């Protein structure tokens with residue numbers, strides 16, 4: 043990804059974008075009961091915690107575009123992945139505006155709590171108005187599509203979330219490149235059925251984990267994997283993608299019955315952005331807040347891994363590459379060992395910065411004991427080994443519970459953390475429940491006991 047140009051929105055007829063400069067995150071009733079070293083992310087250049095220019099830091103993720111064309115390896119990767127998807131019968135039909143807006147089997151309704159993007163965010167209009175879950179009325183939307191069209195600029199917001207101290211001081215705040223509601227609806231009509239097919243088939247055929255339920259899916263993963271696991275992390279995956287990877291993605295779409303609307307992918311690739319008073323153009327880079335970001339990111343990861351394997355190991359058998367991706371996160375396997383360090387080297391040539399899995403200092407062997415996916419480990423259940431526990435580290439849970447954005451959602455937030463925590467075991471879980479109940483707010487929460495969660499889990503398969 044690379045910014046081609048940046049300048050004042052007024053110079054080109056665009057209004058300044060108003061963005062709250064104060065974090066909604068504040069210590070919660072449990073702030074001093076649990077240990078945590080993360081704080082709210084810098085949201086403005088004035089934030090006293092800064093130790094470097096903010097503007098420069100939040101845009102440094104666009105490291106450049108390393109490659110220009112789709113080479114032989116990428117093309118072979120495209121053919122093989124497109125081949126797997128083919129065995130799914132993904133309905134190539136366009137999604138009717140009703141299902142696209144309010145959802146259907148395999149696709150959830152639009153999220154009413156997220157920005158509506160330009161121009162609506164400059165007119166004061168909000169999603170609550172345009173959309174109506176009860177009537178499932180397309181009329182208002184339609185009247186807006188015809189009025190403002192598509193390919194509308196992406197409104198860029200700084201993501202309000204917890205970050206390490208270092209990332210606060212280096213202004214490494216993440217950004218939310220929000221797509222207008224129009225674009226989001228169009229894209230969901232265009233790729234609606236593709237999304238659904240993926241959501242309904244997490245696994246090694248789609249090579250996707252999007253829409254999955256860890257409590258059930260974790261038990262299926264080991265069976266799907268080949269003998270030898272391999273993994274690695276990406277640094278700024280989304281922003282590092284070069285235009286060629288988008289072309290490769292279109293090739294895939296074209297081959298499975300969507301050559302029809304690959305133009306949409308171009309907007310993800312060559313995009314127009316609005317940040318505050320400034321406007322800029324980005325060549326490459328997957329925008330964070332578009333319809334299908336997670337899925338197209340996963341599809342591209344499937345192309346990338348196949349590509350690096352073909353480039354590094356001529357003769358490799360892709361039919362035995364078993365991988366599952368969720369955006370940049372991935373858990374992959376092959377019947378034979380592979381050098382992740384080697385793959386990382388080939389990665390640089392494709393514009394990808396790959397490092398040892400889970401911040402390891404060096405590329406070491408990936409095992410079922412040390413492998414993680416979605417921050418979760420894999421741990422066979424003591425009493426029934428064939429059932430696998432997705433285990434989120436308590437540290438992550440401790441960090442999250444120490445803050446709140448709305449006291450009205452404390453019950454839901456803590457309840458959610460409990461559904462993650464109990465997998466760490468009864469002893470740990472009860473210590474967690476105990477600390478929660480050491481202050482008034484916690485004692486008033488309705489939290490599930492261990493046995494209730496474990497028994498429910500056992501019956502869920």
Ligand SMILES: Nc1ccn([C@@H]2O[C@H](COP(=O)(O)OP(=O)(O)OP(=O)(O)O)[C@@H](O)[C@H]2O)c(=O)n1
Nearest residue numbers: 201214216217218276277278279280281330370
């Ligand atoms: N609104 C956003 C913005 C970014 N991201 C994701 O967050 C990543 C960047 O987060 P950070 O953890 O700060 O990036 P990494 O470079 O992956 O961290 P590291 O340096 O430790 O490798 C991006 O690639 C993207 O996948 C996201 O999910 N939502």
Ligand code: NA
Nearest residue numbers: 310311326327
């Ligand atoms: Na882009």
